[PDB]
Amino acid sequence: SGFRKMAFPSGKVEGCMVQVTCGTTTLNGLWLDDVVYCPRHVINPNYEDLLIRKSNHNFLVQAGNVQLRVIGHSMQNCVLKLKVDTANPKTPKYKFVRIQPGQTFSVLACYNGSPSGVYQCAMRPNFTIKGSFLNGSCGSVGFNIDYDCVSFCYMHHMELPTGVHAGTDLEGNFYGPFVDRQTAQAAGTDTTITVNVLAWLYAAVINGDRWFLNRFTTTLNDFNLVAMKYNYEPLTQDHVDILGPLSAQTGIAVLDMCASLKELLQNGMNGRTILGSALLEDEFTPFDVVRQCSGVTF
Amino acid sequence: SGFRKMAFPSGKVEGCMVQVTCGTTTLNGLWLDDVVYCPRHVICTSEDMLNPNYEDLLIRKSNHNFLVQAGNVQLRVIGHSMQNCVLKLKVDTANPKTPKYKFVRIQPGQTFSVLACYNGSPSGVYQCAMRPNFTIKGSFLNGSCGSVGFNIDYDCVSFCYMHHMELPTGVHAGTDLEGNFYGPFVDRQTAQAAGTDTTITVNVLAWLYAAVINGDRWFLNRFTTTLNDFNLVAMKYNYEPLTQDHVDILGPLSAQTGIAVLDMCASLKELLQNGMNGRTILGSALLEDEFTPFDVVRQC
Numbered sequence A: 001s002g003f004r005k006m007a008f009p010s011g012k013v014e015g016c017m018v019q020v021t022c023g024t025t026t027l028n029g030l031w032l033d034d035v036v037y038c039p040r041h042v043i044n045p046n047y048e049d050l051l052i053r054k055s056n057h058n059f060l061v062q063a064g065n066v067q068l069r070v071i072g073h074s075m076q077n078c079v080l081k082l083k084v085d086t087a088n089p090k091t092p093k094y095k096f097v098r099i100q101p102g103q104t105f106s107v108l109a110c111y112n113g114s115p116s117g118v119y120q121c122a123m124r125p126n127f128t129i130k131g132s133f134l135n136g137s138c139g140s141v142g143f144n145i146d147y148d149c150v151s152f153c154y155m156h157h158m159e160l161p162t163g164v165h166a167g168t169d170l171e172g173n174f175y176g177p178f179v180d181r182q183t184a185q186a187a188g189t190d191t192t193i194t195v196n197v198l199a200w201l202y203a204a205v206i207n208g209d210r211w212f213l214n215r216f217t218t219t220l221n222d223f224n225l226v227a228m229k230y231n232y233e234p235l236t237q238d239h240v241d242i243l244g245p246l247s248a249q250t251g252i253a254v255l256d257m258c259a260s261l262k263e264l265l266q267n268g269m270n271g272r273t274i275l276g277s278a279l280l281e282d283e284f285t286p287f288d289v290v291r292q293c294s295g296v297t298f
Numbered sequence B: 001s002g003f004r005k006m007a008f009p010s011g012k013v014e015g016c017m018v019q020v021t022c023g024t025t026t027l028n029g030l031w032l033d034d035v036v037y038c039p040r041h042v043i044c045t046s047e048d049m050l051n052p053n054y055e056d057l058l059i060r061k062s063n064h065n066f067l068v069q070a071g072n073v074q075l076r077v078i079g080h081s082m083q084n085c086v087l088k089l090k091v092d093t094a095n096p097k098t099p100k101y102k103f104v105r106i107q108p109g110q111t112f113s114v115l116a117c118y119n120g121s122p123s124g125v126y127q128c129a130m131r132p133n134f135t136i137k138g139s140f141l142n143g144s145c146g147s148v149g150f151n152i153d154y155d156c157v158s159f160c161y162m163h164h165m166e167l168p169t170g171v172h173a174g175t176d177l178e179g180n181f182y183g184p185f186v187d188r189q190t191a192q193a194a195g196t197d198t199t200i201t202v203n204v205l206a207w208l209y210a211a212v213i214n215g216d217r218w219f220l221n222r223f224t225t226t227l228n229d230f231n232l233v234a235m236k237y238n239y240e241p242l243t244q245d246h247v248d249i250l251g252p253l254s255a256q257t258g259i260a261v262l263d264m265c266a267s268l269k270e271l272l273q274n275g276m277n278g279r280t281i282l283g284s285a286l287l288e289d290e291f292t293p294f295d296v297v298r299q300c
């Protein structure tokens, strides 16, 4: 029993964190094989013009107490790739994956190439992450672990004026309509990840919290008309299919749980909590719920 | 900016997790140097869990009865001893991945990271606090016994908890790494219940200071309070008494924000009286109590 916001074990990623210094800017790098990936803002910015002026010895890369020597550099979108002479012996089995809004991942927050914390979060529908980062956290990475394979999905680049964070996939493509420069940028109005709230309501049922259940069901269209009113993302037939295993396990049809959610949105919690929360939690995917309520290991 | 419940990076602990099997029972072990630490109840059978005589069950065991597995490698047990509720299995190989470590016993209100494991394989990491009633509100299933709680400070891993059991309310009980249980619990299947839990007041105050550091001030008020008046009110909401030690501990956060501890106590009293009124503090509609004053200074 119990339901916690759980992150993947970060060990396979800790062995990849390095410090990257260029000029006065120090941030984090991801050392995989003989390449160090880091935000290109380490170099009105014409990044082609800025990178051409830099030589390999301008980038000081530090892996623990060992300085790696840079033997090449190239840019791929908003990520700088520093070719190093040494392949990381701790390189795990990995993939670069781009995630969709609503998908969750673990973030290994780093400062000066040293991991300081690990937390679980979700890519918001507005493409920001509500992370916890300070100055020097740039280059910190988001990931998921599948068996023995680390799927890198995020690299931190900046903080928006509202305190939320913006970054790219490992190929340098930003999540969201953001650019890597000091300019007027704002996160769009956020919405609640509906499929994730439903997954969390199923997790509450699996943990013995049933007070919010009711005899009612709803059509997908009627639920979505309610979801639009409360700034909740539309629930698709794909989401309903994805919730299938949890619906079979608890005996509560997805549209039956949708009527519970509709009543919760119109009436509130009434002083009650669900899994120790007075708000509807949306940072657990259906897969996260199954994984935690079954104990899958890595 | 931002405030998350952050766990320590678990890598230094992952390289210590092993599987320990004794008969039909399989649980997790912590392999540090040439010793594997695990709950002693790994030696318990079916008609043993109610009233086990661990000394009697252990004397009947030999080293080869304990199967220890580190990844795909079976470690050879060359000795065994019991220290309180932990079994110490001497192995023939020192863990090359052993980090700099200490065994520390924590007090209620202290937080730590838990590396939840099944079959010696880490599955997740989360943050939690030792409740005032000595239980932890963890996320543990069958086979998670032997999973450990820890903090990392200056490259040193301080092991503070080892998971042993789940109480009937879904809360968890365990020991420090010397085998001493936290709370009035025993590693027996006899009727045991967690005491009434209370809110960790010093942690709620630390979290209110974290909210102020992050720009949220809506809950502040023009009032102050005496420590005694705060404790009389707080106890009525099942909040732990705030001691002068707690007030001293909150000193640095009080100096940083410019809000005296007793002025923040008056905001807390008012929040307990009024509730949040549809508002949130650091993305939460409840008062968070699993961040210590030290965690707040660390993260903010």
Ligand SMILES: O=C(Nc1cncc2ccccc12)[C@@H]1CCSc2ccc(Cl)cc21
Residues within 6 Å of the ligand: A001, B041, B049, B140, B141, B142, B143, B144, B145, B164, B165, B166, B167, B172, B186, B187, B188, B189
């Ligand atoms: O509680 C125990 N195991 C578990 C530990 N954490 C989470 C669990 C979730 C679900 C089922 C079992 C879980 C064991 C076996 C049951 S009776 C018992 C009595 C005393 C002692 Cl020390 C251990 C145990």
